[PDB]
């Protein structure tokens, strides 16, 4: 649908780190976000272009537990369209969510994941994570960083899956407030 397509065009970029291929969401200005396990370095390949990462901060919850979200500042020639207003104030569930994926290997894809329900605790590959949500869809490898959306709202970042189920880190507006 319209919102999704626009989001892909204006905000979602194919990326590559030493950990592999990832989908990346640009939020505003030169601020972007990745799944923590992508482990961005001093630099990253964005659309086949070697870009400098200026800042990299990993998000943890009130008790210091991993949220699986890394916020990076980019050395870039342009600014991302500002979508903070499409991100809810509170981590929000959803009904018929589209998972937007875009890596060099899985380009410009819209995956129908169904209902997104509140999960919470998640053992992601041996690393404890909080503030996760879940969808019943056979999610596969290479989809991490994928953007979960529904009716104009950007609500989560795909971080992993167990074969029958997919999991995303929830998105709150507060994660992205100015600098």
């Amino acid at each position: 649908l319209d919102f999704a397509l626009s989001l892909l065009r204006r905000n979602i970029r194919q990326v590559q780190t030493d950990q592999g291929h990832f989908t990346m969401l640009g939020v505003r200005d030169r601020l972007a976000v990745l799944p923590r396990h992508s482990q961005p370095g001093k630099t990253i390949w964005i659309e086949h272009k070697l870009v400098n990462v200026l800042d990299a901060v990993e998000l943890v919850d009130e008790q210091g537990v991993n949220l699986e979200l890394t916020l990076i500042t980019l050395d870039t020639n342009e600014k991302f369209r500002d979508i903070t207003k499409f991100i809810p104030e509170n981590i929000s569930t959803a009904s018929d969510a589209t998972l937007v994926i875009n890596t060099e290997h899985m380009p410009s894809m819209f995956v129908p994941v169904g209902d997104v329900v509140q999960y919470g605790f998640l053992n992601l590959s041996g690393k404890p994570t909080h503030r996760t949500m879940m969808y019943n869809f056979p999610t596969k490898a290479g989809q991490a960083g994928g953007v979960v959306t529904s009716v104009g709202k950007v609500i989560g970042i795909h971080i992993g899956g167990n074969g029958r189920q997919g999991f995303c880190a929830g998105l709150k507006r507060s994660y992205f407030a100015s600098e």
């Binding site: 800042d55 990299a56 901060v57 998000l59 210091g64 979200l69 507060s174 994660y175």
Partner: peptide, 7 residues
């Protein structure tokens, strides 16, 4: 080591 932030 990573720079952290409580959110």
């Amino acid at each position: 080591k990573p720079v952290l932030r409580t959110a």
